[PDB]
Design an enzyme around this catalytic site. Sequence first.
Site, mmCIF file in Angstrom:
data_model
loop_
_atom_site.group_PDB
_atom_site.id
_atom_site.type_symbol
_atom_site.label_atom_id
_atom_site.label_comp_id
_atom_site.label_asym_id
_atom_site.label_seq_id
_atom_site.Cartn_x
_atom_site.Cartn_y
_atom_site.Cartn_z
ATOM 1 N N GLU A 35 125.253 44.753 49.709
ATOM 2 C CA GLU A 35 124.338 45.887 49.834
ATOM 3 C C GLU A 35 123.478 45.806 51.094
ATOM 4 O O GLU A 35 123.256 46.820 51.760
ATOM 5 C CB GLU A 35 123.426 45.960 48.608
ATOM 6 C CG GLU A 35 124.079 46.476 47.321
ATOM 7 C CD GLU A 35 124.512 47.936 47.388
ATOM 8 O OE1 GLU A 35 124.140 48.645 48.349
ATOM 9 O OE2 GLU A 35 125.236 48.366 46.464
ATOM 10 N N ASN A 46 120.841 58.626 52.671
ATOM 11 C CA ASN A 46 122.000 59.206 52.006
ATOM 12 C C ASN A 46 122.135 60.693 52.325
ATOM 13 O O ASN A 46 121.187 61.351 52.769
ATOM 14 C CB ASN A 46 121.898 59.007 50.495
ATOM 15 C CG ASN A 46 121.878 57.558 50.110
ATOM 16 O OD1 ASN A 46 120.956 57.096 49.444
ATOM 17 N ND2 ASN A 46 122.873 56.814 50.565
ATOM 18 N N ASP A 48 122.322 63.193 50.347
ATOM 19 C CA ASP A 48 121.534 64.091 49.510
ATOM 20 C C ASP A 48 120.047 64.072 49.861
ATOM 21 O O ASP A 48 119.252 64.697 49.149
ATOM 22 C CB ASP A 48 121.732 63.748 48.026
ATOM 23 C CG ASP A 48 121.238 62.354 47.670
ATOM 24 O OD1 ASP A 48 120.782 61.611 48.566
ATOM 25 O OD2 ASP A 48 121.311 61.992 46.476
ATOM 26 N N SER A 50 118.001 61.362 49.865
ATOM 27 C CA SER A 50 117.296 60.174 49.404
ATOM 28 C C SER A 50 117.575 59.009 50.351
ATOM 29 O O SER A 50 118.436 59.087 51.224
ATOM 30 C CB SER A 50 117.741 59.782 47.996
ATOM 31 O OG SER A 50 119.134 59.492 47.974
ATOM 32 N N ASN A 59 117.404 53.205 45.053
ATOM 33 C CA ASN A 59 117.464 54.565 45.576
ATOM 34 C C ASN A 59 116.226 55.383 45.198
ATOM 35 O O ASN A 59 115.753 55.328 44.059
ATOM 36 C CB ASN A 59 118.730 55.250 45.049
ATOM 37 C CG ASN A 59 118.819 56.696 45.461
ATOM 38 O OD1 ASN A 59 118.428 57.590 44.716
ATOM 39 N ND2 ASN A 59 119.351 56.938 46.656
ATOM 40 N N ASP A 101 119.981 50.382 31.992
ATOM 41 C CA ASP A 101 120.049 51.829 31.814
ATOM 42 C C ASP A 101 121.327 52.300 31.135
ATOM 43 O O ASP A 101 121.401 53.477 30.767
ATOM 44 C CB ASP A 101 119.913 52.530 33.170
ATOM 45 C CG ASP A 101 119.447 53.975 33.046
ATOM 46 O OD1 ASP A 101 118.543 54.242 32.222
ATOM 47 O OD2 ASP A 101 119.997 54.849 33.748
HETATM 48 NA NA NA Z 1 125.094 50.439 49.982
#
Ligand code: NA
Length: 129
Positions: A35, A46, A48, A50, A59, A101
């Site tokens: 990551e 991103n 979108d 974010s 995120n 989650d």
């Molecule tokens: Na990533």
Amino acid sequence: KVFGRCELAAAMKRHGLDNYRGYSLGNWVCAAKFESNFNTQATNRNTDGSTDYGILQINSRWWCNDGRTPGSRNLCNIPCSALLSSDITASVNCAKKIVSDGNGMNAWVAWRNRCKGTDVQAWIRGCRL
Ligand code: NA
Ligand SMILES: [Cl-]
Ligand code: NA
């Protein structure tokens, strides 16, 4: 801060991630490597609108507030800038909420595509834990 491999494994163990929700420590080290390349200051925007923040690329649409992602939630109740600290407490605490989650570690696309199903113990080999 850019962590070393065994340095990060030790810190993650001290913060209670080893076998959290059944995920052994190598899973978490593998996810951090792909990551963020172990860099606490990593950010990525991103499509979108974010942004992903920190060593586990958490995120802004669901988990933290950065003041520029309209119509988003702040489920970890933290400013996103707290996730860039050299101290990983805020990233670890929020990651514990995410993995609980429902979808487990599949929430991290890099884990599903590069760590799941591999020999993840190799990521902690040789470390004094
Ligand atoms: Na990533
Ligand atoms: Cl699971
Ligand atoms: Na948000």
